[PDB]
Amino acid sequence: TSWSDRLQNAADMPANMDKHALKKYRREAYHRVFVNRSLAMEKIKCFGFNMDYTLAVYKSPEYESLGFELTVERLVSIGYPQELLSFAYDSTFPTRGLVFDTLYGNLLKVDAYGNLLVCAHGFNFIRGPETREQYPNKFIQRDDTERFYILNTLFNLPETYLLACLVDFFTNCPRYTSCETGFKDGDLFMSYRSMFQDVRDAVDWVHYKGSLKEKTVENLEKYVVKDGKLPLLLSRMKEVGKVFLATNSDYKYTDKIMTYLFDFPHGPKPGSSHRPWQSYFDLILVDARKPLFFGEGTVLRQVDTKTGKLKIGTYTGPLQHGIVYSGGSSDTICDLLGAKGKDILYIGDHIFGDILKSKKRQGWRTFLVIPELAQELHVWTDKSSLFEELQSLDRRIKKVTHDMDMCYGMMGSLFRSGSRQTLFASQVMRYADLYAASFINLLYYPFSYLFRAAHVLMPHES
Amino acid sequence: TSWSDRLQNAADMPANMDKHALKKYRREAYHRVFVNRSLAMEKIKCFGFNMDYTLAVYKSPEYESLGFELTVERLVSIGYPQELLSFAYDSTFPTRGLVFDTLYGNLLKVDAYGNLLVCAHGFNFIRGPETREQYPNKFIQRDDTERFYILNTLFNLPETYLLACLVDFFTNCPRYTSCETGFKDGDLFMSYRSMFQDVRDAVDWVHYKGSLKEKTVENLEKYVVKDGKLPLLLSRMKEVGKVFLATNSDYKYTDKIMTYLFDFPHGPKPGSSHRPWQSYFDLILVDARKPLFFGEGTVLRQVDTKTGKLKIGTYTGPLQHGIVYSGGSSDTICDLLGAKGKDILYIGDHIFGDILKSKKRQGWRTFLVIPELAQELHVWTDKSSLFEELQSLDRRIKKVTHDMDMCYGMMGSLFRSGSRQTLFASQVMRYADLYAASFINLLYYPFSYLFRAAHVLMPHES
Numbered sequence: 001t002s003w004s005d006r007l008q009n010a011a012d013m014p015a016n017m018d019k020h021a022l023k024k025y026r027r028e029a030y031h032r033v034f035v036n037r038s039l040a041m042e043k044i045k046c047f048g049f050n051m052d053y054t055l056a057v058y059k060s061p062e063y064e065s066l067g068f069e070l071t072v073e074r075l076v077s078i079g080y081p082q083e084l085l086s087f088a089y090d091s092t093f094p095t096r097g098l099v100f101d102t103l104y105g106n107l108l109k110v111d112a113y114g115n116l117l118v119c120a121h122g123f124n125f126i127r128g129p130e131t132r133e134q135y136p137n138k139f140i141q142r143d144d145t146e147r148f149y150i151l152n153t154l155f156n157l158p159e160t161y162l163l164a165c166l167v168d169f170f171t172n173c174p175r176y177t178s179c180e181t182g183f184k185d186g187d188l189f190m191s192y193r194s195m196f197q198d199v200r201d202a203v204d205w206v207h208y209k210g211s212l213k214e215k216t217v218e219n220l221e222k223y224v225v226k227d228g229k230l231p232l233l234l235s236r237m238k239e240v241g242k243v244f245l246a247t248n249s250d251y252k253y254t255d256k257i258m259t260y261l262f263d264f265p266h267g268p269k270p271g272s273s274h275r276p277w278q279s280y281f282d283l284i285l286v287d288a289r290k291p292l293f294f295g296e297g298t299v300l301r302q303v304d305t306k307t308g309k310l311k312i313g314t315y316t317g318p319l320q321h322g323i324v325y326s327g328g329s330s331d332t333i334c335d336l337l338g339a340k341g342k343d344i345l346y347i348g349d350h351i352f353g354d355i356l357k358s359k360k361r362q363g364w365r366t367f368l369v370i371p372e373l374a375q376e377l378h379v380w381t382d383k384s385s386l387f388e389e390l391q392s393l394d395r396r397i398k399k400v401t402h403d404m405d406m407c408y409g410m411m412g413s414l415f416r417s418g419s420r421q422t423l424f425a426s427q428v429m430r431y432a433d434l435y436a437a438s439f440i441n442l443l444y445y446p447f448s449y450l451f452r453a454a455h456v457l458m459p460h461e462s
Numbered sequence: 463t464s465w466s467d468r469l470q471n472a473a474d475m476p477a478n479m480d481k482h483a484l485k486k487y488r489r490e491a492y493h494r495v496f497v498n499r500s501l502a503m504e505k506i507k508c509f510g511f512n513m514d515y516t517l518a519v520y521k522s523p524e525y526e527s528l529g530f531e532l533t534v535e536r537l538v539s540i541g542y543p544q545e546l547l548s549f550a551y552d553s554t555f556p557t558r559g560l561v562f563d564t565l566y567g568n569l570l571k572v573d574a575y576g577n578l579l580v581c582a583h584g585f586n587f588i589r590g591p592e593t594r595e596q597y598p599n600k601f602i603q604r605d606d607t608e609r610f611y612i613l614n615t616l617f618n619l620p621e622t623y624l625l626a627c628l629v630d631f632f633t634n635c636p637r638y639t640s641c642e643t644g645f646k647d648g649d650l651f652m653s654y655r656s657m658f659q660d661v662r663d664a665v666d667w668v669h670y671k672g673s674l675k676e677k678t679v680e681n682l683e684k685y686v687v688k689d690g691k692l693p694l695l696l697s698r699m700k701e702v703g704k705v706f707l708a709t710n711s712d713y714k715y716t717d718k719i720m721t722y723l724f725d726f727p728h729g730p731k732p733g734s735s736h737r738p739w740q741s742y743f744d745l746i747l748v749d750a751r752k753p754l755f756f757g758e759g760t761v762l763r764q765v766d767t768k769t770g771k772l773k774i775g776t777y778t779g780p781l782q783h784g785i786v787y788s789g790g791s792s793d794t795i796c797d798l799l800g801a802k803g804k805d806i807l808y809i810g811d812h813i814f815g816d817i818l819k820s821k822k823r824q825g826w827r828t829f830l831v832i833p834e835l836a837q838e839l840h841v842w843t844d845k846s847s848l849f850e851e852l853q854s855l856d857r858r859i860k861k862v863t864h865d866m867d868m869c870y871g872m873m874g875s876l877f878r879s880g881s882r883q884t885l886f887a888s889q890v891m892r893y894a895d896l897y898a899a900s901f902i903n904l905l906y907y908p909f910s911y912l913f914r915a916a917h918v919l920m921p922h923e924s
């Protein structure tokens with residue numbers, strides 16, 4: 001049972017919009033919207049979306065496993081050894097938000113202050129004393145972006161696993177000599193850093209120049225969660241506000257995916273005429289180039305939707321029905337929709353590019369979609385008494401911590417290691433006003449709901 | 463009753479070190495150390511200090527008022543109008559942490575997300591609708607450091623008031639025409655930005671080239687809090703760990719101030735021989751140039767303590783008894799004292815340069831001294847039922863908010879406006895492990911105390 005199995009199981013359920021059935025439904029943690037800061041829904045005038053892992057949630061482990069295979073195939077074709085072909089994606093290893101230390105070749109799970117929670121070199125989990133050899137203070141400076149790369153997106157899950165597979169393979173292959181900062185193969189030295197760069201380049205290539213998009217679109221049922229409640233929720237949002245799409249993807253891909261997500265023999269509700277995905281949006285913007293989008297952005301372009309090419313020149317005209325934009329900036333959206341930042345609820349899965357930057361740069365309200373939560377909630381609930389045991393204790397503490405963490409996977413929970421919260425968890429609490437396993441959970445709350453969080457008090461104020 | 467009156471009242475009290483008298487004492491909020499994150503004192507191997515507003519707490523409003531007078535005198539001498547001489551420092555206006563908007567000439571009190579809590583143009587407090595004219599989303603991008611300057615230090619209190627005095631004077635003087643971004647005086651245009659720069663330059667000049675230091679040192683009793691418990695606490699720290707001083711000040715000034723702080727006819731306890739301030743430190747570093755100190759730093763120099771000049775050249779020798787260093791970096795301290803970051807408790811008043819940067823860059827443990835807390839606690843306690851009233855209500859809400867805030871001053875509490883926490887309050891919670899009105903409050907806790915904060919849980923985990 002992957003998180004996308006949980007999500008698709010929920011998607012297969014028709015909507016019962018009886019006011020009491022809705023209240024009853026959002027009692028289950030799985031269908032709730034979780035609140036970091038209060039948000040009066042009646043003040044929200046525009047709902048904005050990212051596509052990838054928001055509207056189009058890719059099925060797991062199938063989509064990660066396809067990315068992994070194509071990245072491996074790309075590395076082998078540029079001259080990495082044949083043995084790479086014998087790797088197979090393992091969804092029980094990677095947790096999102098890990099840091100790759102490019103100097104020493106370690107994956108690290110860290111808290112918000114750069115304290116090390118987990119260190120693995122390949123598939124060897126390094127304990128306390130040995131980690132102090134490389135990290136004397138058990139601490140990394142995460143502003144050292146040349147050395148440390150944070151694998152924060154769901155697109156980075158295959159490469160998280162692949163980095164560990166590579167370190168493991170080269171360490172154990174007698175053709176290579178292991179050094180502190182990489183591997184010697186006779187007169188060739190491959191540093192962890194240049195290995196990491198090859199991996200990152202091959203992932204980029206696979207998405208932009210390779211076969212990933214082609215293979216996705218030829219089997220959408222296999223790769224993409226589909227839900228009859230999607231048109232229903234978007235149509236209800238459009239009744240009370242404007243709705244926009246701002247995606248990094250190009251028009252052709254977006255049109256293929258979105259067509260699929262809306263491909264029902266009815267519109268919003270069963271019985272209603274089907275309508276094209278585009279009619280659900282007051283504004284559609286592709287090639288957004290987020291996070292730059294939330295600063296200077298790029299020049300505003302117009303898509304020729306017949307060819308899928310951009311028209312030549314900067315677009316200087318008004319918002320017209322049927323027009324599709326490319327590039328631009330967050331100010332474009334505000335100007336064209338007549339919105340102030342605080343009137344906008346922006347819905348995305350990228351805790352940096354989407355959510356952090358629209359909050360810090362523009363004061364947008366934010367809803368983070370966290371697909372893994374659909375399964376982390378099930379673990380959190382039926383290891384209730386394991387965390388409670390941990391909480392009661394403050395040697396047994398390290399053991400309980402370990403067994404709590406293993407229930408999630410080899411790299412533990414997205415949100416913690418025992419009683420120590422992750423960097424990812426702290427970015428969520430600080431920058432996501434609202435969050436959930438799916439934005440569909442909004443359907444379970446009335447139009448003008450006040451999501452409420454308790455007022456925060458300092459220690460001297462308590 | 464200023465906060466430094468509270469502090470000096472407490473300093474005049476001899477230490478009763480009876481174990482039960484200590485427990486009883488730290489029951490009072492005024493003598494407590496407040497905990498944002500747990501800290502086992504037994505793990506602390508080095509205690510590090512800043513001097514200014516930490517060891518040497520300048521008396522208020524006297525010291526601010528002296529800075530204000532000398533800054534005014536400096537502005538007048540470079541050609542600002544004579545009317546400036548009729549300004550008088552008013553300690554009831556400025557609150558620390560305000561933002562000066564150099565485009566529009568406003569002081570702003572903001573939360574951690576850049577939302578505006580208070581806007582004043584000169585001495586006119588601008589209400590909701592009028593503020594939306596300049597701040598359509600009631601929001602500033604605080605990463606716009608060219609436009610916005612944050613007045614975060616106690617040294618910035620005189621200039622906070624002076625900026626408002628200047629805007630007020632030029633607005634109401636018929637020689638000048640008020641414009642959106644400054645003042646026209648015939649064929650001369652003075653922008654708020656260049657006015658701000660003049661003020662900032664004159665404050666800098668007053669500290670580095672003017673008479674502020676001279677006037678301080680000629681009347682130390684008037685300007686600097688002195689406490690017999692200081693030598694006592696430092697001596698107790700030295701029994702269990704190393705103690706260091708790392709200050710931005712030069713040697714001559716530091717020697718004058720520190721000599722005064724230790725000028726008792728006894729050492730640590732009454733009855734004991736007096737010892738020189740320098741014997742209380744395993745390492746003394748002046749001209750630290752923080753915050754750069756916590757990165758590359760500067761070249762390590764040696765002070766010639768006879769002349770107060772630097773010896774010529776980079777110092778390459780060991781830590782020797784009696785040596786005084788200049789410049790260097792945080793790594794110098796760690797290397798010479800044989801400390802890891804987490805073994806260090808760094809004690810300072812600058813929530814950015816001291817505390818933020820040693821935490822983020824080096825993983826040091828942090829103790830923030832917040833002098834105003836010595837008085838904000840007294841207001842928090844006897845407006846108990848005013849905040850409680852505010853808490854019960856969630857038009858009356860705006861009124862209660864206003865009357866709560868006025869008890870603190872015109873720009874309200876350092877920590878909030880009603881139920882909305884300030885940027886400053888959020889920087890404290892996130893980067894200060896421990897905080898208090900004075901670091902002397904450490905004297906009330908045993909050697910190996912565990913300061914404890916409850917574990918943090920996300921909303922879905924609660």
Ligand SMILES: O=C(O)[C@@H](COP(=O)(O)O)OP(=O)(O)O
Pocket residue numbers: 822
């Ligand atoms: O969260 C962030 O975006 C940064 C910046 O904080 P601000 O200076 O923008 O408040 O804090 P970090 O997590 O790196 O300590």
